[PDB]
Short mmCIF file of N, CA and C in Angstrom, two decimals:
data_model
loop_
_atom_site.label_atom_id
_atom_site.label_comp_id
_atom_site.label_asym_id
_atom_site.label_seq_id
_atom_site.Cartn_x
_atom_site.Cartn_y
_atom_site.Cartn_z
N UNK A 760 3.60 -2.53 44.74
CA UNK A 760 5.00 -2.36 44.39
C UNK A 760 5.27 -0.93 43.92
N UNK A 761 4.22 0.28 44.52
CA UNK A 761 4.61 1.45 44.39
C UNK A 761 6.59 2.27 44.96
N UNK A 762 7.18 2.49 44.45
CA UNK A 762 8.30 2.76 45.11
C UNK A 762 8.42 3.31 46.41
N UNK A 763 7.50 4.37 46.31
CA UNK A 763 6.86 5.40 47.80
C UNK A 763 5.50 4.77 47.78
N UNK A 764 5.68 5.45 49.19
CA UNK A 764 4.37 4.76 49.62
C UNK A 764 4.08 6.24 50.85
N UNK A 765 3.03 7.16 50.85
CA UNK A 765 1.77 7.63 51.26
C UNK A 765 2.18 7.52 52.88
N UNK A 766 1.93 8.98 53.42
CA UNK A 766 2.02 8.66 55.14
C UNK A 766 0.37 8.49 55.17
N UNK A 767 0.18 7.74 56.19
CA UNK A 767 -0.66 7.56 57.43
C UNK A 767 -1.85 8.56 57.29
N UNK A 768 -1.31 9.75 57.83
CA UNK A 768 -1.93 10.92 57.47
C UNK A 768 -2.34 11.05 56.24
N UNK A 769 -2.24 10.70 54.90
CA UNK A 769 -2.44 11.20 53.95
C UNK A 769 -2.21 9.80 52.76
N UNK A 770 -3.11 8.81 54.03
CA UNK A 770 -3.18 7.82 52.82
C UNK A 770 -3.74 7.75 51.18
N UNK A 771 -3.13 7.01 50.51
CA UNK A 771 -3.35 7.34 48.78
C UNK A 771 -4.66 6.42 48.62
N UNK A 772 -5.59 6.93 47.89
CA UNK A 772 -6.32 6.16 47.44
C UNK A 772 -6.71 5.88 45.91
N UNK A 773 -6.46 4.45 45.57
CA UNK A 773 -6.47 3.82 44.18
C UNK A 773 -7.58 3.59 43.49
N UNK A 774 -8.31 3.92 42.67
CA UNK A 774 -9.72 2.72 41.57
C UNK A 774 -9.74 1.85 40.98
N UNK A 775 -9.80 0.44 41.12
CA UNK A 775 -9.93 -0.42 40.45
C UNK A 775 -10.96 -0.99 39.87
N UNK A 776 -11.39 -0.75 38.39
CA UNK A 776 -12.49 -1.42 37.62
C UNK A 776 -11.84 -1.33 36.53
N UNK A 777 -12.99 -1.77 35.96
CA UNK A 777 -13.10 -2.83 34.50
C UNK A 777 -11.80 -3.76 34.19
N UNK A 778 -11.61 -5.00 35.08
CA UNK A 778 -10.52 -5.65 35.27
C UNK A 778 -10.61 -6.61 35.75
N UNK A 779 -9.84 -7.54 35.63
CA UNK A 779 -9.64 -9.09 35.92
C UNK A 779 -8.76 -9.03 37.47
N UNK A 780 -9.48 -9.93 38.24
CA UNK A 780 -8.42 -9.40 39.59
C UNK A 780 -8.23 -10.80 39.66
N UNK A 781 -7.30 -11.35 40.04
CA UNK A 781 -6.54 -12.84 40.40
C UNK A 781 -5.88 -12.65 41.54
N UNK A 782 -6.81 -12.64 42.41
CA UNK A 782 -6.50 -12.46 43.80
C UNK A 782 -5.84 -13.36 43.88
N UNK A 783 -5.42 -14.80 43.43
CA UNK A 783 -4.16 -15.47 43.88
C UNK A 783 -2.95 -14.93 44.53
N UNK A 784 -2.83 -14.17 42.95
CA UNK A 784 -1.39 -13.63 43.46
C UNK A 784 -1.23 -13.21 44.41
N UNK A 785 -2.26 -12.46 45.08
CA UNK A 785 -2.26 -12.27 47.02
C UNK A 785 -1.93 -12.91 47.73
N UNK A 786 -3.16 -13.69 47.50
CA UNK A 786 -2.87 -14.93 48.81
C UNK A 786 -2.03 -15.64 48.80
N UNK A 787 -1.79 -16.37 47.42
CA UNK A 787 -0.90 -17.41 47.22
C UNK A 787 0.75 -16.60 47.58
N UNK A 788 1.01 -15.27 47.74
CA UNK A 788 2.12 -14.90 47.72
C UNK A 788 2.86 -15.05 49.30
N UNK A 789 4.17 -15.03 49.35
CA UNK A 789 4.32 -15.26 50.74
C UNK A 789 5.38 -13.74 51.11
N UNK A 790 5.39 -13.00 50.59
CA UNK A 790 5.43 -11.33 50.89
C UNK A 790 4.64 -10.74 52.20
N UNK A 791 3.21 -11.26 52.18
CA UNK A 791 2.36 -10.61 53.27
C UNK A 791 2.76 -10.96 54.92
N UNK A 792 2.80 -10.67 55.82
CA UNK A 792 2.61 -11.04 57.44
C UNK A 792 1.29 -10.84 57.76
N UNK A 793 0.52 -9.96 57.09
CA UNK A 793 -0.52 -9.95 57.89
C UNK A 793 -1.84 -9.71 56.82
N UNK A 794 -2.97 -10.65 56.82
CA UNK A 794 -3.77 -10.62 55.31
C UNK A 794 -5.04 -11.58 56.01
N UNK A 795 -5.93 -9.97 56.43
CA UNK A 795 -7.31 -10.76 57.29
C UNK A 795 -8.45 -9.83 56.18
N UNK A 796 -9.45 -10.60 56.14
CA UNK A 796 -10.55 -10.01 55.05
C UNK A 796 -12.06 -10.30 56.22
N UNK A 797 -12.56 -9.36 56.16
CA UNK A 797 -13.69 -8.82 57.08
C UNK A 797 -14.83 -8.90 56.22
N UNK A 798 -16.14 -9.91 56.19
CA UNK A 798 -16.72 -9.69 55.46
C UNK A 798 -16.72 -11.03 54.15
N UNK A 799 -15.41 -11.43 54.03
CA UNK A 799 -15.49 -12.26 53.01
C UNK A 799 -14.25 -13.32 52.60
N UNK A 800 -14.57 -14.42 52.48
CA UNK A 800 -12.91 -15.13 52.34
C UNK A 800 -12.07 -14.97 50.99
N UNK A 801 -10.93 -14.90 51.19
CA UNK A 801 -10.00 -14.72 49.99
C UNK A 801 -10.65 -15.32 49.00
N UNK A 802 -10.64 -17.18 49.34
CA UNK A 802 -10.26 -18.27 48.36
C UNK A 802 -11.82 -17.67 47.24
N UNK A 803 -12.94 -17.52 47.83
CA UNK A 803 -14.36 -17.13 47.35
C UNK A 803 -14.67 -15.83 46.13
N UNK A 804 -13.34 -15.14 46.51
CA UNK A 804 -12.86 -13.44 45.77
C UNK A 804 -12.85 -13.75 44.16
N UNK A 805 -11.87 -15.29 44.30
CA UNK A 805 -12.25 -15.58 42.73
C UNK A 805 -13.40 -15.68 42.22
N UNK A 806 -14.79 -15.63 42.57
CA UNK A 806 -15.85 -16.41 42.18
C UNK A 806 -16.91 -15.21 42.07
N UNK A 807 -16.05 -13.60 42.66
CA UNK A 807 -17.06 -13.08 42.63
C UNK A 807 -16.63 -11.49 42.22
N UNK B 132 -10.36 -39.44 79.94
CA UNK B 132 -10.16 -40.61 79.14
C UNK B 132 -9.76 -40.71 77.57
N UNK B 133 -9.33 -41.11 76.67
CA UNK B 133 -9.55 -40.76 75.42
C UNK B 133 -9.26 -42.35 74.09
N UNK B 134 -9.92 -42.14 73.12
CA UNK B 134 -10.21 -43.70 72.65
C UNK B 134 -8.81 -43.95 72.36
N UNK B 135 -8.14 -42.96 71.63
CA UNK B 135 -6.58 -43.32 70.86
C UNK B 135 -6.39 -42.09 70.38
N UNK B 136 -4.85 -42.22 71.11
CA UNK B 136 -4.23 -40.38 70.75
C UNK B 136 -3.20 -40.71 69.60
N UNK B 137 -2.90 -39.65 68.92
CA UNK B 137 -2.25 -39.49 67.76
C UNK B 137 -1.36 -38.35 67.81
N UNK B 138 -0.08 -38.74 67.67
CA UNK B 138 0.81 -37.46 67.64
C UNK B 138 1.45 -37.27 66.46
N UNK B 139 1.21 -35.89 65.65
CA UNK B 139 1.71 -35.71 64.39
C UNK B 139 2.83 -34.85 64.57
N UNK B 140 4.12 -35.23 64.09
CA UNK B 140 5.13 -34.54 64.20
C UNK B 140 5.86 -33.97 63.03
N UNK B 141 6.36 -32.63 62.84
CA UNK B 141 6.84 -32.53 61.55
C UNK B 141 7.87 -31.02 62.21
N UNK B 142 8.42 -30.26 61.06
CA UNK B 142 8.99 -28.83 61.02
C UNK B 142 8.17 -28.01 60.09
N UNK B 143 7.90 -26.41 60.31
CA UNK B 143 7.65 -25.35 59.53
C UNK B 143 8.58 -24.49 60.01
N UNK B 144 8.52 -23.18 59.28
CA UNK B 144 8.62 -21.88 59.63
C UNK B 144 8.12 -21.66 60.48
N UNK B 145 7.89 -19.66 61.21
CA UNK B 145 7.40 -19.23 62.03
C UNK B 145 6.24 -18.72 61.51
N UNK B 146 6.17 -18.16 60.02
CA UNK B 146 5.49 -17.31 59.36
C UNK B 146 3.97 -18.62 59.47
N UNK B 147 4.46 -19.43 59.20
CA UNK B 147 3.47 -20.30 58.34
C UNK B 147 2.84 -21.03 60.02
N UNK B 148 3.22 -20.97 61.24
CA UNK B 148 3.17 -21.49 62.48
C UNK B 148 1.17 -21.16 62.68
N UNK B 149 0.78 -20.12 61.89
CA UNK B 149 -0.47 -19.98 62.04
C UNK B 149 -1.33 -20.58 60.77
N UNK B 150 -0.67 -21.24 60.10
CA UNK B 150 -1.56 -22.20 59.34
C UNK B 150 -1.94 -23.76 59.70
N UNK B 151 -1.13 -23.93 61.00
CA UNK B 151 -1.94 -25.26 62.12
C UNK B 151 -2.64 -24.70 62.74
N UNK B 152 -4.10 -24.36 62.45
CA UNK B 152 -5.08 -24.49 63.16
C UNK B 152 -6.30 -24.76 62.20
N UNK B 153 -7.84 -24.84 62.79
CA UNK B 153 -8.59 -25.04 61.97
C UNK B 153 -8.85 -24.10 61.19
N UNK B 154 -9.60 -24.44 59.49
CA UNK B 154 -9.77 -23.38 59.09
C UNK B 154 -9.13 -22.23 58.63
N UNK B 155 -7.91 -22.39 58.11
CA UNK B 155 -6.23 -22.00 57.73
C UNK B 155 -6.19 -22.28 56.49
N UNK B 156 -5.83 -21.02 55.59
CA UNK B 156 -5.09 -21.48 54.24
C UNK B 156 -3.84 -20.96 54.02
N UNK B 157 -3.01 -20.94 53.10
CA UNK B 157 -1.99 -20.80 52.85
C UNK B 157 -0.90 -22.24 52.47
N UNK B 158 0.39 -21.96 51.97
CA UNK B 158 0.85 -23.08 51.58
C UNK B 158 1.14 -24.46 52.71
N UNK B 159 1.28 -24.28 53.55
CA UNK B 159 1.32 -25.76 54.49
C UNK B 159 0.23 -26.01 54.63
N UNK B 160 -1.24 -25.63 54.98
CA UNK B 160 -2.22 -26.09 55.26
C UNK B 160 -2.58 -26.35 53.99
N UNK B 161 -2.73 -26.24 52.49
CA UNK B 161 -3.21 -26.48 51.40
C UNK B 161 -2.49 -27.91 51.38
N UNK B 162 -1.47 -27.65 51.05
CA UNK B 162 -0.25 -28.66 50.13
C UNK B 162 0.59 -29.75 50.94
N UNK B 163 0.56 -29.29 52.87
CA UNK B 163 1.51 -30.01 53.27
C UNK B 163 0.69 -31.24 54.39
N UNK B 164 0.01 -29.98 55.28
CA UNK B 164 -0.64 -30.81 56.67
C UNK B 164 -2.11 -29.68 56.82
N UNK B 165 -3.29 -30.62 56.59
CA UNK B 165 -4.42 -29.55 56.76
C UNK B 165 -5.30 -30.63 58.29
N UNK B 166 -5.52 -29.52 58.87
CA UNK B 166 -6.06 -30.08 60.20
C UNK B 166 -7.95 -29.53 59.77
N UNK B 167 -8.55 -30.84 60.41
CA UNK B 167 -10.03 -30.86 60.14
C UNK B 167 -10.88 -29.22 60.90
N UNK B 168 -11.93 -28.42 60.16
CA UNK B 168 -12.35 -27.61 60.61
C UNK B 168 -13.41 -28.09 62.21
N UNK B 169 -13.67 -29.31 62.46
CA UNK B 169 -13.96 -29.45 63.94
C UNK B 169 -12.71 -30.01 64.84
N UNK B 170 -12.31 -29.93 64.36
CA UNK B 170 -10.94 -30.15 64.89
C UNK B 170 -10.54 -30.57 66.34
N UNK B 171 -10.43 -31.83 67.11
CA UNK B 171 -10.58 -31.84 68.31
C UNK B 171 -8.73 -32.39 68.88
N UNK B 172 -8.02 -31.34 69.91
CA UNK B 172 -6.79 -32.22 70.50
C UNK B 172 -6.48 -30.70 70.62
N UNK B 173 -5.06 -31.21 70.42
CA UNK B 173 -3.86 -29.74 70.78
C UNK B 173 -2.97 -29.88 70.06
N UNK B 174 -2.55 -28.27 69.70
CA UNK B 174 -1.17 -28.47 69.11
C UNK B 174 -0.05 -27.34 69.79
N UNK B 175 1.12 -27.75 69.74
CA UNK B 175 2.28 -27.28 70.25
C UNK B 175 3.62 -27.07 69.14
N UNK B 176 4.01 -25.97 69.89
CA UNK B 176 5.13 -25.33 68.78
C UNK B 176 6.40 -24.86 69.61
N UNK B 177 7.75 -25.03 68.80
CA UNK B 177 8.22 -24.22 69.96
C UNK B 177 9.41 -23.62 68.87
N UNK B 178 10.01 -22.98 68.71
CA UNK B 178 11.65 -22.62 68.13
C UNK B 178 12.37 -23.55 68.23
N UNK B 179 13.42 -23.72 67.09
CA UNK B 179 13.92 -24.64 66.90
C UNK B 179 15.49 -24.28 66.42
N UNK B 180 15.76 -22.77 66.19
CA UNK B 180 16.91 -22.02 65.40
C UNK B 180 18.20 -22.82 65.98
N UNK C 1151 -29.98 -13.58 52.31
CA UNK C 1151 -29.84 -14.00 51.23
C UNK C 1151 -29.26 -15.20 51.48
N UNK C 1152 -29.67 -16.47 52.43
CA UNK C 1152 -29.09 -17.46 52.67
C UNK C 1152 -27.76 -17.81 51.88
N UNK C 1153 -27.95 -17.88 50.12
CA UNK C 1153 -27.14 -17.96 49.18
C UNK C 1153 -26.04 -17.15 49.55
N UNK C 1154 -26.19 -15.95 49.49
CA UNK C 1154 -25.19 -14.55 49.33
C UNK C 1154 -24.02 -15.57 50.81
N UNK C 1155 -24.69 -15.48 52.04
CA UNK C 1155 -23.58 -16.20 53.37
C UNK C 1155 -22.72 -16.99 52.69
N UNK C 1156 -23.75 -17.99 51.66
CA UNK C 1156 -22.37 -19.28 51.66
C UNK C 1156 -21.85 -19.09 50.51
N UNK C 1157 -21.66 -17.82 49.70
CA UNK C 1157 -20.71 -17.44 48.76
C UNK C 1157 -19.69 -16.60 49.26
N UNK C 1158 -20.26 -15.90 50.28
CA UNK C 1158 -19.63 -15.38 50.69
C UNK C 1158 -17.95 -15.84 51.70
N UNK C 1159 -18.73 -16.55 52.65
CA UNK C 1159 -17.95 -17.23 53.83
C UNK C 1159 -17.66 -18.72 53.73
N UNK C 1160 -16.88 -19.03 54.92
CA UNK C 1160 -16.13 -20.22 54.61
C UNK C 1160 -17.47 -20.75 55.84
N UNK C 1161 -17.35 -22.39 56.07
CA UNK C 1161 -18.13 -22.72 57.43
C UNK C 1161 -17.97 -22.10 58.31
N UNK C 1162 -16.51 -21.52 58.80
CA UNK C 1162 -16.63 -21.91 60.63
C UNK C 1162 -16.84 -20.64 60.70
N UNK C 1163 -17.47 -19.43 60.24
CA UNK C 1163 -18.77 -18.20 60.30
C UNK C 1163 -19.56 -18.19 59.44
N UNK C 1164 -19.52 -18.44 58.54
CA UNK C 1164 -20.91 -19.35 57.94
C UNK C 1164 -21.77 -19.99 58.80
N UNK C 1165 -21.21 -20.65 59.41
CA UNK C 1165 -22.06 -21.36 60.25
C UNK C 1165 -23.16 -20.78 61.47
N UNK C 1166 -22.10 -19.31 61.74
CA UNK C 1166 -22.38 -18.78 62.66
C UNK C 1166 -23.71 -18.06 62.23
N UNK C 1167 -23.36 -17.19 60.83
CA UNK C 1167 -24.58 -16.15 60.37
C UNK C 1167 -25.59 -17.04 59.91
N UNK C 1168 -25.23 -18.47 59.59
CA UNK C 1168 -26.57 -19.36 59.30
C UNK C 1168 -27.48 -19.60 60.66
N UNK C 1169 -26.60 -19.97 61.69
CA UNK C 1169 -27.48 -20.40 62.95
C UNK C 1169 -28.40 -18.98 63.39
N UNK C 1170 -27.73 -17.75 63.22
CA UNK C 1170 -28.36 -16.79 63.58
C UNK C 1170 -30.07 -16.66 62.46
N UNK C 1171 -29.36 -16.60 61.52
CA UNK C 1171 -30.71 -16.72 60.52
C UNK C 1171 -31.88 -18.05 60.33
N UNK C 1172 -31.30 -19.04 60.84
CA UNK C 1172 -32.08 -20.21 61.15
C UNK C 1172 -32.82 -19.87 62.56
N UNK C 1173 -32.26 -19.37 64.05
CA UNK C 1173 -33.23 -18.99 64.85
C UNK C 1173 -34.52 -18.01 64.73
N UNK C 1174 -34.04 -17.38 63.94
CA UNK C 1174 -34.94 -16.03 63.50
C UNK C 1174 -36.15 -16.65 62.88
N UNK C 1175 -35.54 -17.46 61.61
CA UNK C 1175 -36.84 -18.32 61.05
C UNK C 1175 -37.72 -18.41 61.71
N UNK C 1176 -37.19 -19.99 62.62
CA UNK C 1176 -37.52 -20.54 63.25
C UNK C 1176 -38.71 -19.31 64.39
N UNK C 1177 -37.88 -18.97 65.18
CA UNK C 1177 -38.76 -18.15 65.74
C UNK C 1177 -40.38 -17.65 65.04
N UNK C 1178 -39.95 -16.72 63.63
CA UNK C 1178 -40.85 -16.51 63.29
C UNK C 1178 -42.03 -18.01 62.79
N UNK C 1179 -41.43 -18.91 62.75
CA UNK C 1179 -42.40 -20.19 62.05
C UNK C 1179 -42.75 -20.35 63.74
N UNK C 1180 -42.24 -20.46 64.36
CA UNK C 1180 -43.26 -20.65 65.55
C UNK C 1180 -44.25 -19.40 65.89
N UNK C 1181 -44.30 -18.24 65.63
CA UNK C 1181 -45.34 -17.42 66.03
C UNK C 1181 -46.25 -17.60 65.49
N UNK C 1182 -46.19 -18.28 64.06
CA UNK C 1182 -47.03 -17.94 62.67
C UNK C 1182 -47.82 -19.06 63.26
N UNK C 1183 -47.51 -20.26 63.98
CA UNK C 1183 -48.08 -21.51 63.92
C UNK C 1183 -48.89 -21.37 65.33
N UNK C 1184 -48.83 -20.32 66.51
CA UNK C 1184 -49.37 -20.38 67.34
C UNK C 1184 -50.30 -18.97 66.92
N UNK C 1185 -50.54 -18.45 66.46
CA UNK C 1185 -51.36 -17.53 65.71
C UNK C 1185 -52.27 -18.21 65.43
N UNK C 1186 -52.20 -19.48 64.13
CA UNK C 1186 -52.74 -19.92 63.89
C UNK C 1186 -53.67 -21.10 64.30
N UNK C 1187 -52.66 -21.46 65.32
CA UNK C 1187 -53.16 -22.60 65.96
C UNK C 1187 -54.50 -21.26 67.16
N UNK C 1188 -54.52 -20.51 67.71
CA UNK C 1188 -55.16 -19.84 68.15
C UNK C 1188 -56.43 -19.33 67.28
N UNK C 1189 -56.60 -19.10 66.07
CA UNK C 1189 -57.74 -18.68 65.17
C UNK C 1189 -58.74 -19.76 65.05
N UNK C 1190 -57.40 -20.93 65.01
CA UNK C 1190 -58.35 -22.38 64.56
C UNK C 1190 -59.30 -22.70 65.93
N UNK C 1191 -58.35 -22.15 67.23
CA UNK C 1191 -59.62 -22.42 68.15
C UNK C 1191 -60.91 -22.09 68.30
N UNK C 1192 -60.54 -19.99 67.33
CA UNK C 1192 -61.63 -19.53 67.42
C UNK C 1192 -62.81 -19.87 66.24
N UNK C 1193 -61.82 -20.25 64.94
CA UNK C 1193 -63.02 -20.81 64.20
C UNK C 1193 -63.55 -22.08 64.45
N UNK C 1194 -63.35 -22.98 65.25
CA UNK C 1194 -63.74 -24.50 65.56
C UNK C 1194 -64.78 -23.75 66.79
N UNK C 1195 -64.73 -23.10 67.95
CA UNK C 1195 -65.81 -22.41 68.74
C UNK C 1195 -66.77 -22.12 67.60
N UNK C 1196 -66.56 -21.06 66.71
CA UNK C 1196 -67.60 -20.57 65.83
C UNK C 1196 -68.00 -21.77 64.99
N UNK C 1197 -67.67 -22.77 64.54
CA UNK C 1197 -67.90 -23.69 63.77
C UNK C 1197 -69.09 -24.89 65.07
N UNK C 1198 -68.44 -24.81 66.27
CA UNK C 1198 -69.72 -25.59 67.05
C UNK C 1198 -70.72 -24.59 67.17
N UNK C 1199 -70.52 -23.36 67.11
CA UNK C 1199 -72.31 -22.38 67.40
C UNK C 1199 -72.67 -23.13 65.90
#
């Protein structure tokens, strides 16, 4: 929910640690069209 | 040939049209209609606006 | 890390990186057993001298 958002060219990159992530709010949200994970399933993200 | 067919009929969205298949989460496949991960038949969709 | 797959993944590729790692086993438990089964011939020869 950044206001701007970063061209293509010159994508932004973020750090996330020492933090609680509740990937729910992802998945469970219905905002996304498109939400594929390579490597690992959403629902499992909580557990790890 | 087949022992006994079953036709499940209902409405969704378009968004959610990819949570009938196997192996699908999101809110219709959690909460509404979840189809088995061996999953054997067909399913069909069409617009409805 | 057999474990690590099924924390990782759901079945229907789970399944997939398990079958891959179950042939491999497998494979290797069959070399190990015709290795062996081959020594035993040669120590049962040396065991009739």
């Amino acid at each position: 929910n950044a206001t701007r958002f970063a061209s293509v060219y010159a994508w932004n990159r973020k750090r996330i640690s020492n933090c609680v992530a509740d990937y729910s709010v992802l998945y469970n949200s219905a905002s996304f069209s498109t939400f594929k994970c390579y490597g690992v399933s959403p629902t499992k993200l909580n557990d790890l | 040939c087949f022992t006994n067919v079953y036709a499940d009929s209902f409405v969704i969205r378009g968004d959610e049209v990819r949570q009938i298949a196997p192996g699908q989460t999101g809110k219709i496949a959690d909460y509404n209609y979840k189809l088995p991960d061996d999953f054997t038949g067909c399913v069909i969709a069409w617009n409805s606006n | 890390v057999l474990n690590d797959i099924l924390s990782r993944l759901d079945p229907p590729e789970a399944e997939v990186q398990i079958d891959r790692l179950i042939t491999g086993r497998l494979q290797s438990l069959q070399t190990y057993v015709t290795q062996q089964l081959i020594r035993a011939a040669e120590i049962r020869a040396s065991a009739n001298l």
